[PDB]
Amino acid sequence: HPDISVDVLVIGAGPTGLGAAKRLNQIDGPSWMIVDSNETPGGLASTDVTPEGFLYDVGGHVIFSHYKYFDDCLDEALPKEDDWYTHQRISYVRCQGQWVPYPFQNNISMLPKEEQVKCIDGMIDAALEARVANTKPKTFDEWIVRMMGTGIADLFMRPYNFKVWAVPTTKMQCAWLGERVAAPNLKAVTTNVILGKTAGNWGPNATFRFPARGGTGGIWIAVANTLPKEKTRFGEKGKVTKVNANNKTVTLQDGTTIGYKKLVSTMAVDFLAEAMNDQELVGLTKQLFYSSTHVIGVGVRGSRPERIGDKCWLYFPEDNCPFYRATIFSNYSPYNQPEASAALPTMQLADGSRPQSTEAKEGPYWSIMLEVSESSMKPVNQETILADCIQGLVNTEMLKPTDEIVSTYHRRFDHGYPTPTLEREGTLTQILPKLQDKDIWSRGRFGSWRYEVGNQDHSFMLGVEAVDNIVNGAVELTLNYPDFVNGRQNTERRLVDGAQVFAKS
Amino acid sequence: HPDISVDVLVIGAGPTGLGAAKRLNQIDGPSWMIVDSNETPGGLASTDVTPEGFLYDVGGHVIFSHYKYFDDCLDEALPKEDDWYTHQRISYVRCQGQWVPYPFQNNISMLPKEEQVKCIDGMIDAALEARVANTKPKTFDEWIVRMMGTGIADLFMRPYNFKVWAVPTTKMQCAWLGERVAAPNLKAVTTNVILGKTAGNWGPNATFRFPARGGTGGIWIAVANTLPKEKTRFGEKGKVTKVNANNKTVTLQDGTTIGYKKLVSTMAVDFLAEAMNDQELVGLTKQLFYSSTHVIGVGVRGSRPERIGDKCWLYFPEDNCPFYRATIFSNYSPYNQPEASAALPTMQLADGSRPQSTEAKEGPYWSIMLEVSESSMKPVNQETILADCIQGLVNTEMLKPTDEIVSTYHRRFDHGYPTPTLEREGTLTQILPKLQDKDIWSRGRFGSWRYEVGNQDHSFMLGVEAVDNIVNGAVELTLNYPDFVNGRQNTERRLVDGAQVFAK
Amino acid sequence: HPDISVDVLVIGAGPTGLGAAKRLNQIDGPSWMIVDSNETPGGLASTDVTPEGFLYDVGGHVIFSHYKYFDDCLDEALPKEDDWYTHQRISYVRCQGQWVPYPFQNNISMLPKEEQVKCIDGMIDAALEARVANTKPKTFDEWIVRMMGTGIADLFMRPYNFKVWAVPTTKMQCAWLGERVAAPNLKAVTTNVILGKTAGNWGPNATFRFPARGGTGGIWIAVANTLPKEKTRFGEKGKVTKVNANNKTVTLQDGTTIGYKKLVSTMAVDFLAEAMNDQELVGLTKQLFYSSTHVIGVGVRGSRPERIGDKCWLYFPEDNCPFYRATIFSNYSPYNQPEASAALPTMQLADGSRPQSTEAKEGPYWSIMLEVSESSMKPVNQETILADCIQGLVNTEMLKPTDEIVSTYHRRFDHGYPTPTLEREGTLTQILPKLQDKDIWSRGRFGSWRYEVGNQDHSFMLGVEAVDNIVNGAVELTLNYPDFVNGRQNTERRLVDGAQVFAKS
Amino acid sequence: HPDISVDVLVIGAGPTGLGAAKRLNQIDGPSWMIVDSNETPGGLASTDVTPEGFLYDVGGHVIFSHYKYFDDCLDEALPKEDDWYTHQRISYVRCQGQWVPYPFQNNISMLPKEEQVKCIDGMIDAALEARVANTKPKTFDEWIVRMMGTGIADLFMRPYNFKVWAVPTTKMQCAWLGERVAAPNLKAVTTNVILGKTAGNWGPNATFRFPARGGTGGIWIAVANTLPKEKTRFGEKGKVTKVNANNKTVTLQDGTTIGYKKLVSTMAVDFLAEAMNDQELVGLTKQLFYSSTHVIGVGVRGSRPERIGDKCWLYFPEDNCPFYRATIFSNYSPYNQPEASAALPTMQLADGSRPQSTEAKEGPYWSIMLEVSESSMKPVNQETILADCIQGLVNTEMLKPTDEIVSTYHRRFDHGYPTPTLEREGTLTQILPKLQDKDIWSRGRFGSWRYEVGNQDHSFMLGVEAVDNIVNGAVELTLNYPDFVNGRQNTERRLVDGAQVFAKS
Ligand SMILES: O=c1ccn([C@@H]2O[C@H](COP(=O)(O)OP(=O)(O)O)[C@@H](O)[C@H]2O)c(=O)[nH]1
DSSP: OOOOOEEEEEOOOOOHHHHHHHHHHHHHOSOEEESSSSSSOOOGOEEEEEEESSSESSSSBBBBBBBBHHHHHHHHHSSSSGGGEEEEEOOEETTTTEEEEGGGGOGGSSOOOHHHHHHHHHHHHHHHHHHTTSSOOOSSSHHHHHHHEEEEEEIIIIIHHHHHSSSSSGGGGGOOOOSSOOOOOOOHHHHHHHHHHHOOOOOOOOOEEEEEESSHHHHHHHHTTTTGGGEEESSSOEEEEEEEEETTEEEEEEOOOOEEEEEOOSEEEEEEEETTTHHHHHHHHTTSEEEEEEEEEEEEEOOTTTTTTTTOOOOOOOOSSSSSSEEEGTTOGGGGGGOOOOOOOEEEETTTTOOOSSSOBOOOOEEEEEEEEBBBBBBOOTTHHHHHHHHHHHTTTSOTTEEEEEEEEEEEEEEEEEOTTHHHHHHHHHHHHHHTTTTEEEEETTTTTOOGSHHHHHHHHHHHHHHHHHHOOOOOOOHHHHHHHSOOOBBBBSSOOOOOOOOHH | OEEEEEEEEEEOOOOHHHHHHHHHHHOOOEEEEEESSSOOOOGGOOOOETSSEEEEESSOOOOOBBBHHHHHHHHHHHHHHHGEEEEOOOOEEEEEEEEEEEOOOOOGGGGGHHHHHHHHHHHHHHHHHHTOSSSOOOOOOHHHHHHHHHHHHHTTTHHHHHHHHOOOOGGGGGGGGGOHHHHHHHHHHHHHHHOOOOOSSBTBBBEEESSSOOTTTTHHHHHHHTSSSGGGSSSSSGGGGEEETTTTTEEEETSSSSEEEEEEEEEHHHHHHTTTOOOHHHHHTSSSOOOEEEEEEEESSSSSSTTTTTTEEEEEOOOTOOEEEEEEGGOOOOOGGGOOOEEEOOEETHHHTOOOOOOOOOOOEEEEEEEEEEEEBBBBOOTTTHHHHHHHHHHSSSTTTOOOOEEEEEEEEEEEEEEBTTTTHHHHHHHHHHHHTTEEESSSSTTTGGGGGGGGHHHHHHHHHHHHHHOOOOOOOHHHHHHHHTOOOBOOOOSHHHHHHHHH | OSSEEEEEEOOOOSHHHHHHHHHHHHHOOOOOEEEEESSOOOGOOOOOTTTSSSSEEEEEOOOOOOOOHHHHHHHHSOOSSGGEEEEEEEEEEEEEEEESSSSGGGGGGGGHHHHHHHHHHHHHHHHHHHHHHHSSSSSSSHHHHHOOHHHHHTTTHHHHHHHHSSSSSGBSGGGGGGGOOOOOOOHHHHHHHHHTOOSSOOOSSSSSEEEEESSTTTHHHHHTSOOOOGEEEEEEEGOHHHHHHHTEEEEETTTTTTEEEEEESSSOHHHHHHHTTHHHHHHTTTTTEEEEEEEEEEEEEESSTTTTTTTEEOOOOOOSSSEEEEEEGGGGGGGGSSTTEEEEEEETTTTTTSSOOOOOOOOOOOEEEEEEBBBTTBBTTTTHHHHHHHHHHTTTTOOOTTTEEEEEEEEEEEEEOOOBBHHHHEEEHHHHHHHHHHEEEEESSSTTGGGGGSSHHHHHHHHHHHHHHHHHHOHHHHOOOOOHHHTTOOOOSSOOOOOHHHHOO | OOOOEEEEEOOOHHHHHHHHHHHHHHOOOOEEEEESSSSSSSGGGGGEEEEOOOESSSSSOOOOOSBBBHHHHHHHHOOSSSEEEEOOOOEEEHHHHHHHSSSGGGGGGGOOOHHHHHHHHHHHHHHHHHHHHHHHHOSSHHHHHHOOHHHIIIIIHHHHHHHHSSGGGGGBBBSSOOOTOOOOOOOHHHHHHHOOOOOOOOOOSEEEEEESTTTTTHHHHHHHSSSSSGGGESSSOOOEEETTTTTEEEEETTEEEEEEEEEEOOOHHHHHHHHHHHHHHHHTTSSSSOOOOEEEEEESSSOOTTTTTOOOEEHHHHTTTOOOOEEGGGGGGGGGOOOOOOOOOEEEEETTOOOOOOOOOOOEEEEEEEEEBBTTOOOOOOHHHHHHHHHHHHTTTTTTTTTTEEEEEEEEEEEEOOOOTTTTTHHHHHHHHHHHHTEEESSSSSOOOOGGGGGGHHHHHHHHHHHHHHHHHOOOHHOOOOOHTTSSSOSSSSSSSSHHHHHHH
C-alpha cells in the first residue's frame, strides 16, 4: 500500500495542472491531489524578480481567453477591478530603422517604396497561383510562399521565424497557424499601400488585461490559493522522481508514494517518459523537438522615453540584435518595477561602459524584457548573451548609448516552445495513446506538445477537459481540435455548472 | 404551487427525450421527469402492426450509429445476440427497367450506351469546372450538378430529391450535406463504364443491425423500460397542453401542473410555440418548412421472389410510381410478418383484381414498406394513394399482376421531414436563442429541426447532450456542429463514466 | 470596242490606288491606267488649307509603317532630309483635369487615390479571371474589360470608343485588335501606382516623321508625281459613273469608256456596288456600317503655350467636349500654319466673344485639329459643331477664354471609319468573293472595309499586293491576315526587286 | 572568268531544286541552270527497282498537296488520268496482336478494356491539368504527356517515336507537330470507347494519289523532263565539289566553274558548309541532328492475302520487329511489282529456310516496303537488318513462316530525317541568315532542315518561293511559317500566272 491514495493525481501546478485541480475541486466527487516540485505554482507562467525589484515574466505573456471557464477562475482569484490593467495591443515590427505595425504582412504600406513593389509583386504571384491551386501546402514555408509570396517571405517571414522557432520554416508543419499567422488579402493590402493606411487590429490579443501585482505569476499563485491546501504538495516535497505506470504508483523525491486510479501529468512528456523508465516512450519523446528560451531583463533609469511610448511588444526580424522580441514590461503595470522614489545605483551605461557615479539615485524607471531562442540548429553563447542583448538594444535605438541600466536579469528556460515540426503528429499519435492505455492523461504545453493550444487559457482548459473526460466522458476538444476551440466562444463550461446549483438544494 | 416539481422536465419520449432521460438517470443528480402523450414511447421511431400481423416502421428505418453512448444504451436494452439481426446495407435505384446499384453514378454501365455518353460528357464538364471552382454551391441543386454533372443529376438526384423533400432542389441549402467538395470522381465513374462493371457500396463490413422483434419501435420500448417507472408519465395522462415559460410551469391534459427549473422539449418546435401561447414564436416557427410522410405497407403471399432477393431499400426517381423509397421490410426480421403456417385470405391481386377464392391460405409471406411525401408544393390524395402505390409496385416490377396481397397499411404522419430550405437557419437562429433565454432546450428531429442530425442516434444524443449541457456545462456538439459529430467516432461519453465508477 | 483598253484598271488615287499604280509601274509588264474623280491624289490622306493659311489633314494622320516597300516609295517621293520632320509619338488622355500619359493604365497615379483603389481592385479581378479563362472574348467590350478591369475601362476605353466609333463597344467585334491575350499587366500597373510615377510609351526610339510641306497630302502628291502622267486621269475627266462587270467596261463622267481584264477598285465598296447597278451587292454593302468624320481646325495666335508643349495627339473620353481626339498640328511642321510675320485679324476669342480690335496682327501661330464622329446612333448638329468644339477646347483647358482664334475650318467626310461591327465579316465574306468572281479586286479602307489594315501603309500595300496577286500570284497577306502582317518585319518586297536588277543587264 | 555564268544557280534536282527550276522556267527572266550529281533527278523522292522487278520508293511516300502550284506541275508532268491512282488512306498501328486505326490516340476504343482504362485515366489527368496550364510545353515528351497523358505516352508515343526519330522524345522540340501528331479530345475519345467506334479520318493524307508507273520517282523524272535540257546538268558532270561564296563561284567534279548572282542550294546544308570550306559553318551544321533511313523491300509470291487487304501503311511501336513502318507498296500500283505471269524462283521462305527447288514459278506478287531508322543514339546492324526485318514480318503475322519471298532490297540513306531537336532553331538562326547574307538560299528537307515543311509539296514550294523571293520580293512563307502554309488553301500561285497571260498578248 502506498503512503497516499487518490482517484486522480495531478502532476504539475502550472496552468494546466491548476486547471485540472480547479475542475476536480468544483466537481467535488473523486478524491484528488496535486503536486509540484516548485513551492510556487505557475510553471512557465511564473514571474521572477531581480534584487533591485524589477519583475520579469518568462518572456512576453499577455492574457487573451477563448473560454468563460478560464475567465471565471481568473475573476474568482483576482476579484477586484484594481487587480488588473486593460491595455490595447500596441505592437510593431522593426524594419529598416522604422516601426511597422503588426502584423507586418498587413502593413506593406509602411515599408519603403522599393520593398512595397517587391512585396506586392510577390503577393500578386501568390494570388494568381492560389486561383488554380488544388493541393494543400505541406510545410510552414510552402504555406508562407502560397499565402504571402516570396517578397514577404524573404523580407520578413523566413528570417523572423528562424529567429523565434530556432528551426527553418521548411522544417515545420502548417496546421498550427490559423490564429497565429495573418493571411494577407491582396486587395486590402494594396488598398492600404495606395491610401498610406495602417491595419493594426488582427488577432485574438489585440486587447488584453494584465495583473496589477506580481506579474503573470500572481494569477497562478492566487488561483492555487483557492484550492484546499491539504490537497496540494508544492516544493521539494512535491517533486516526482518515479512513475510506475503498471502499479499506478508515483514516488516523490522524499520517498512518499502515491497510488492513483487516473493520472493527469502536466510535466514535459519527455521528462515523463524518463520518470517512467519506459525506454520505448523515451525514444519516441526524443523524436519531438523544442527550443529553449532565454529571457533577458533590463531595468532602465528615467521617465518613459517618447520613442518608447505606449508600445507593448515588438518584433525584430533583422540581424542587428539577437532577440526576436522585446516587451515594454513597465507598460503592463506600474508594479512591475520600483517606484520613482526608489534609489538604485547605475550598474552600467547601455554602451557597456561604467557610470560616472556609483551613487544610488532615484527613478522613475522603465523596463525591457527580451527573448532569445536556442536549439541544436541555432546555438547561443550563454556567456555573452546578456551583453549581446544590451548592444542590440543600442543598435535598434531602443536604448541610447548613455542610458543608465540599474538592473539586469538572465534566465534560460530549457523547454520554451514545443516546435510544430513536420514529424510532431506522427510522433504524438504514437506517444499519447500508449500513455492513454495506462490511464495517463499527458496534457499541457509540453504535456501534449501542441503549440496552437499552448497559451495559458488553452493549457488551463487542457487540464479542465482532461478531468471532464475522466469523470464525465467529455470530449477533449482543446487537445484534439485546436481550430475548433480557437474559432468559437467557449461559453458552456462554467465555474458554477447546473450540477452545483442543483446539488445545493 | 404546482402538483409536481422537478429540476429537469423532459417533454416527449421518442429517441431524443429518451436520451435526456437515460443521461439524467445515469447522472443521478438533479430530479427529473419525462412525459409523452403516447402510452408507448418511441415517437417516429415506433412501429405499427396490421390486424393481419404485418409490422411497419414509420418508413425505412436503418440505424447507423456515430456514438458509443447510443450503442451502450441499445446493448443494455436488448443485450442478447438473438435480439438483433445483421444485414448488409444493400440498396438500388430503379431506373429505366433496371435495378442500378447505389451509388448510382458508379453503375451507369447498366444504361443504354447513348445515355452513358451523355452522363460521361456531363461529368467531364463538371470535373473541368470543379478544377477551377472558387465558390461553394449555395443550393442543393448547385451541389448536385457540381458533383454529378447534368445528365447524371437529371436521371437520379434531381427528380428523386423532389419526390423525397416535396420541394425543388433549387430551394434547399446544401451545407447540411457536410463539408466534402462538390466535385466528380470522374476516373472511378469512367472506369466502371469502360469495364462494363457494377459495384454497390456494401459488403461484409458495411452492415446494420435491426431488432429481432417489434420492429424499430421495439428498441425504444426496451430502452424506456430501463427507466424508473415512477419518473415517467406516458399516455393521455402525459399529454402536454400548456407551457407557461415565465412561471416555468407545464400543464397536462388532465389538469396536472409540473414545475421545472430547466425544460428539455422534444415536441415539434411549432407545437411548442403554440403550447406557449407565444405569438412571436408562432410567427417564427410557422416560417419553418416540413413535409408529411405517407407510409404504405403491403403484405404479399409467397416466398421471397428472386428478383427481390437480398435488397434492403430502394430509390425511385421516376414518375411511374408515387413513392420515393421502398423497403423489403420482410428482409429485416423474420418476425416483421406472420410465420409461414399462419393462414390469411387474399385481399386482392397486385393488378387490383379480386382473388379466385376468399379462403384463408398459408404463407410464407413477404413485405414491402413504401414512403410518399406530401407538402403544399406536392399534394397527396389520401383516398387513392394506397391503390396508386400498389399500381406503382406493378409498374416498377416489384410485384407481378398476379401477386397476392394479404395485408395493406396506410398512415399519414404530419411532421415527417424537417426541410433544409435556404431559409431554415435564418429562422432557427431566431427561434432557438429565444427559447434558450427561457431555459428551454428545444431539441430533436422537429425539436431543433435539423435533418442532418435527425436520425435515431443524433436524436438520442441531442437529448443526452442537452442534459450534459444543463448539468455539466458540456458543449452541444450534435446540435450546432453536425459535420463535427458525423465525421468522427464519438467514443468519450459512455453509459458508465468515471463519475459512476468512483461513486461506487 | 471601248475608247481605251488596259490589262489592269485602277479606280481611285488615294494611298491604295497609288500603291497599285506604283507596283504596276515597277513591274512594267501589263498595261494599266489609274483614274480619280479628284485632280489631286491622296484621298482621305489629302490635306486642306484655310484662306488664312492653316493646313488640316483629314484628322490626325500619323504614319507607322509595317513595310519596307512603303518606306521605299515615301523615300523616292521625298528624298531629302529636310522633306521631313521627326517627332516622338507623344500622346495623353484627358481625364478629370489631368493630362494622363498614354497608355492610361500605367499612369493612374495622377488620379485621386480612392479612384486608384477602385481601378486596381477591378484590374485584380481581371487578372484573376484571366488566369482561368478558356474562351476568347467575343465583343470589343469584353476585350476591354478583360484587359483593363471595370474601373479602368469605365474611365477611358469604354467612353472614348463610343465617342470614336459612334457605336457602343458591345456592338463591335474584337478580332481586329489582334491575337494578343486580353489580360492585365497587373504588376506594371500597381508598380507605377506604388512608385507614384508616370511614363508614356514614347522615347527616342518611338518616333514618327511628318512631311515638311503640304501636310500628309504632300506625300501622295509627290508619290503620284513619279507615275507616267499619261497613264493617269485625275479630275472630273477621271470620275467613274458606271461599272459594267459582265462586259469588263468602265464609263467615266465625260462618257469615256475603259475596257479592262482586271479591275482594282479602291472606291467605297458600297459606291462600287451602286456603280455596278448590281442590286444584290447593293443590298449586301448596305449591311456594312460606317461613321462619318467631322474635322474641325482652329488656328490660334501666340507662341505655343507651355501647357500644350510637345503634345502630339490627345484622347477625350469625357463628355465635356464633342471631339474624341485633338492633334497639335502646328507641332507636326512649322509649315502647317503661317510664319510669325504673317498678319491676321482675330476672328473671335475662345469664349466666343468679339476681339477688341479688328486689325491684322502678327503671329506666331499654333493650330489644333479636332475630330468628331457621326452615325445614325450618334447625330451631329453640323450648324453648332464648330462652336461646340471651341467650347470643348475651353472646357478641356486646351484654350484659355482669352485665346485669340485667327482661323477656323470645318469639313464633314461621309465615309470616315469602316466600323468593325459584329456583323462586318459575315457580310464581307459574301461581298468580296462575288466581286472576285468578276475579276474585281475591291481593296482599301472602304474598298475592303477593314480598319485594322486601314492605315496609309496598309492601304498602299493592299493595292501593291492586289497587283502582285494579279500578276505574280502573290498571297494577299495584308487583306486576309492583318495579325500576320502587323506582327512581322515586311522586308522582302522592294521598289527594286531582282526582276528589275536582272532585266537591266 | 568562269566557264558558265547565270543569274540563278540551282544546286540539286530533288523536289526542292526542281521547284526552283520550274519557277525560273515559268518566269523566264533571269538566266539559270540546275545541276545534280545524279543522272536521274528526284533525290529522296526517287525509286529503285530490284533485278526481279520490284520497285521501292525511299520508304512510304504518299502524295498530299497543300498547294495548287504543286498540283499544276504534277498535272502538267503526268496529264493523263491513267497516270495516277487515287487511294483512301488505310492505316493502322500494331498493338498487342491487334490493328488499332490511325491515329492510335484517337482510337483507344480498339484497345483491350484494361488498356482503355489506363489510357483514359491518363487522358483525364491531362485534361484537368490543361484546364489550368499557362505555359507551353518545351519538349516533344512534355507535349505528349500534356495532350495525351502517361498511359498513351508509355503504351504508344514514347516507344514509337524513339523507333522512328532514333532519339528519345525528351530531346525534341514540339513546334513541328501541328499537322503530324493528333491531339486527342477527351469527350470524343471516351465517347468512341463507350460506343465501340473508330475515328480514322484525321490528317492531311487521309486521301492520296500515287503515280501509276515508275513509283514516286516517276513524277520527278517527268517534271524534270518539262525543263529545257540545255539548262540542266545531271550526272557526274553536275556534281558540285566546291562552293566559293565570296567569288560567287561553284566548281563541279569535272573542273567546270559556274558564276552565279544568286544560289539556291538544296543539298544538305552540312554538305554545303564542307563544300564552302567554311569552318565556322561546318561547326554550326554539326550542331544539327539527323537520322539515317534503311529501306528494306520484300517481294512475296501469292495473291494478296486476306489479312493484308487494302492496308496502305502500318505503324509498329513494339520491339518485336526493327521497322517503325511497313507499306503495302503493291497496293499503290499494279506496276510496282511484276505481272502474275512473270516467273520467279523462290529466294527464301519467310522463316528463313531455303526453298526446295530453284523452280521459277508464276505469281501473282505482292510487296512490302519497310523502314528502320538509325542514328548515333540507335545503331543498326547492316549485315543482319534484312533478316531481322523478315523475322519481324513473321513476329507481327504480316508473313506466314511458309510465305515465299521472290525478291529482297536493302539500301541505307545517310540523311533520312532532319530531326526537330531542342537545339535546331537556335542553330538554324545562326546558319541560314549567314548564308542569306552571302546570297545563298539554302532550302529543302536538308537544305533548311525543317521537317514540318519537309514533304514533297513543301520541298518543291521551298524552291519555288526562294525563286520568288529572289525575283519578285515574295515572302518565303513555307520556310518561316509552316503552320500558316499548312493551315490554309494555297491557291494564289499558279503555273500560269497573270504575268504569262499578259505577255502572251
Ligand atoms: O497513330 C499514330 C502514328 C504516328 N503518330 C505520329 O506522327 C508522326 C509522323 O509520322 P507520319 O508517319 O505521319 O510521318 P513520317 O514519319 O512518314 O514522316 C510520328 O512521328 C508519330 O509521332 C501519331 O501521333 N499517331
